[PDB]
Amino acid sequence: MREFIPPASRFIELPDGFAMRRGGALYGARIAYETFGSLNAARDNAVLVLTALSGDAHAASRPDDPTPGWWEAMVGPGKPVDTDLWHVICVNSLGSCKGSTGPASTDPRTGEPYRLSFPELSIEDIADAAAHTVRALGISRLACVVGASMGGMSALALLARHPELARTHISLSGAVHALPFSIAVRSLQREAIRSDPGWLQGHYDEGEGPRRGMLTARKLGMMTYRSAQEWDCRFGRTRIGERGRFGPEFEVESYLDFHAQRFADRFDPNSYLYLSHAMDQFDLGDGGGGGGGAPGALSRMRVERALVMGARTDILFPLSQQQEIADGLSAGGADVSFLPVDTPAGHDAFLVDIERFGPPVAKFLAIVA
Amino acid sequence: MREFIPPASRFIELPDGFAMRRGGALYGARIAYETFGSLNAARDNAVLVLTALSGDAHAASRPDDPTPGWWEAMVGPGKPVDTDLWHVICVNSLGSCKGSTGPASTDPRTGEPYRLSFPELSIEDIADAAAHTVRALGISRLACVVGASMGGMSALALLARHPELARTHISLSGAVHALPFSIAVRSLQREAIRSDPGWLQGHYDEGEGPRRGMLTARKLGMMTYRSAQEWDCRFGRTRIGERRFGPEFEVESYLDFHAQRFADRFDPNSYLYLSHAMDQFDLGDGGGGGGGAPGALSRMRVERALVMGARTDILFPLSQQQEIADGLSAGGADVSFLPVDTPAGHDAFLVDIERFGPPVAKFLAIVA
User: What pathway is this protein a component of (chain B)?
Assistant: First the structure.
């Protein structure tokens, strides 16, 4: 299969040829999306959510798919992103494997999966595909565009390329571009996959594939997403309660393997490579002829208000990167609320510490309403 | 060669039947060591140095091996560990592959390398072997025992099991036992090696072997031995200078360059054994176990100690060095605890001699 599509997924076909930033174009492509909450008469209460690398469009549960979403505590009736007030639209990023066209999808020209024939993917492509999706749904201007992690990059690209499409912006643990450490981490993750003989140069298809490499990729990621101190605090030196050479012995090891399995079981290796690479290549200030680099690009955006948050313990996208986003948007006239979160959950905080990330989001949206 | 032995290495043979903590024994085994500086007539100026996992006995350059040592700036005439004052004895840890008996060494019973038949290794074994080495050299009491990183664990095990062997102690970024984060990191490092098809269940032969896996192990280590913040402010997003999904950034080339140097001089199996030993050690299990780790520390007989750690160390967090200082102090030792404000993280004791050297020099000046 290689594609893991939520049962209530809906799709917007990307008409004819969808040109990709680094060359080539996609034909017969589509974007999977899901909505939560009612769109009002003026169609001015829509909120687009661009996800992290591993997410899908099922941000929250619904009657037609009661399974909890990846942001179940953040999106819903009476929640931080209140669906009683907003029409939330969440899209699976182009290049992914949860419904939107990606490497695991069928190429109409061959009848087979794209695999590594998929055009190099750029954050800008994800943004452009999301913009088309919102417009295809009859929305000309979003009340807000929300982006977290990789989605924070996608959101900035959308604001720079489609300035009239969003009134406000919520940026959670994002960045204008990747710094060396995070690049090194993703490099090792991709290495774990490419070093697995099961990858077969991307032609694993229905075989087991580089499952070993995927597990490791996820473990390395998880270890970098939350503070070392929190890890020591959550597991200590506790041995596995389950009680043959050099195998796992500590609960922390069992914990990592358990979650690594779930990821490896629901993600396409090639899709992972493309998305990971896109994160390393994105650079908001790199082109267009405007000048000033990233700060300049942020200043030229047209959002009226913005909420920018980051975790003090985040080592993937350090707090300073979120502050840079806030400063640039403010330099351009936006009314920006910046909030550093004192959480031990690092980069994963926007997902696992909604107790802390939620209230500020609710506060901001109450002003936008 | 399976072993990477410094040319000026000397050896002390371990008694046949040397008992390993987790079972089994060693026969025809030995410990490789090197010395720097002269021992005085009274034999009261000896300083033992227990190294980090990747080190060897060549702490500094010498006439019979001018190659720079792993602690070149720390050990020598007029340096922090002044060889004009001390007879420095540095030993290669048991289980390593730089001279001391380990997985890559020849098992006298078979005439072939031990490979995975080497008995499971414990920090306590490294300590016992080092203790035998010191005594074999006719030294009844060291002026000081220095331990860094893994060596910090080894040194504590030595102080606990052989209390009359050392007068003072210098503990650099050590711990009484490993915390979860470091265990997870080492687990992944070992995984990178065992996942490499070239490992062959430890029966790899001459030529590469699980080289790619060894490279990954070292890269993951380097990425955790230093502050993530320090990384971002050293390479930026510069691409590789020399012209699917391969490396592109200078930070990647840097990691690969240094990782290869490691893979070229370390035995995979030896690495696995040493790494595992670090996860298994718990100073609290010793001496009846009364009072756990703090109790063991208080029961030690050192008179003075210098305990240092890096504020940015995430493998052996500062709290662990504070624990060592408190335990030793609670037991009567005159302890000097110094948190170092450095961005070098765990590797600080190796790369930031500017901040680690003065304190060590001052402490030893008092011990002199």
Answer: Antibiotic biosynthesis
Contact B283, B132 (CB under 8 A): no
In 3D space, the residue among B59, B22, B100 whose CA is nearest the CA of residue B267 turns out to be B100
The region that residue B267 occupies, defined by phi over 0 for left and psi between -120 and 50 for alpha, beta otherwise, is: beta
Q: Is B35 left (phi over 0), alpha (psi -120 to 50) or beta?
A: beta
Going from the N-terminus, what domains does chain A have, and what CATH number goes with each? Answer: 1-178+282-369 (3.40.50.1820), 179-281 (1.10.1740.110)
Active-site residues of B, by number, are 149, 313, 346
Instruction: Give the position of tokens 């007068």.
Output: B167
Is the CB of residue B121 less than 8 Å from the CB of residue B272?
no
Active site residue A149: yes
Task: Write the DSSP symbol of residue A279.
Answer: H
Residue (of B287, B319, B323) closest to B305 by Cα position: B323
Closest residue on chain A to B236 (Cα): A180
Q: Which candidate in B176, B183, B189, B274 is best for mutational testing of the A interface (most A CBs within 10 A)?
A: B183
Q: What angle do CA A99, A102, A103 make, to 5 degrees?
A: 135
Q: How far is A293 from chain B (nearest CA, A)?
A: 14
Judge contact between A298 and A329, C-beta under 8 A: yes
Where does B208-347 have alpha helices with state H? 211-225, 228-235, 250-263, 268-280, 292-299, 318-330
CA A54 to chain centre: 6
Q: B203: distance to nearest CA of chain A, Å?
A: 14
Chain mean position to CA A195: 25
Q: Could you give the angle at the alpha carbon of A14 between the alpha carbons of A10 and A20, nearest 5°?
A: 130
The experimental technique behind this entry is: X-ray
Please tell me which of the candidates A184, A191, A246 has its beta carbon nearest to residue B272. A246
Are B274 and B178 contacting, i.e. CB atoms less than 8 angstroms apart?
no
| CA separation for the pair B54, B87 (Å, rounded) | 23
Residue A148's SS3 state is: strand
Considering only the C-alpha atoms of chain B, give the largest distance between any 2 of them, rounded to a whole number of Å.
65
Could you say which DSSP state residue B139 is in? Answer: -
Contacts of A198 in chain B (CB under 8 A): none
How far apart are the CA of B177 and the nearest CA of chain A, in angstroms?
Answer: 9
How far is A135 from A267, CA to CA, in rounded Å? 28
Q: Spell out the residues 6+ positions from residue A237 whose beta carbon is closer than 8 angstroms to its own.
A: A250, B177, B178, B179, B180, B183, B282
DSSP 8-state code for residue A62: B
How far is A150 from A172, CA to CA, in rounded Å? Answer: 10
Which member of A216, A237, A245 has the closest CB to residue B188?
Answer: A216
Q: How deeply is B241 buried, as exposed, middle or buried, from its count of CB atoms within 10 A (0-12, 13-18, 19+)?
A: exposed
Element (H, E) at A273: helix A269-281
**Angle value at C-alpha A122, between A121 and A128, nearest 5 degrees:** 110
* CB-CB under 8 Å, B196 with A195: yes
* Closest Cα in chain A to B228: A181
Length of chain A: 369
Q: Does B240 touch chain A (CB under 8 A)?
A: no
Q: What is the resolution of this structure in A?
A: 1.7
Task: Please indicate whether residue A314 is annotated as part of the active site.
Answer: yes
271-290 of A, contacting B, C-beta below 8 A = 273, 277, 280, 283
Cβ distance of B232 and A318 shorter than 8 Å: yes
Return the SS3 of A64: coil
Whether residue B220 lies within 8 A of chain A, CB to CB, comes out as yes
> Rounded distance, CA B2 to CA B114, Å?
11
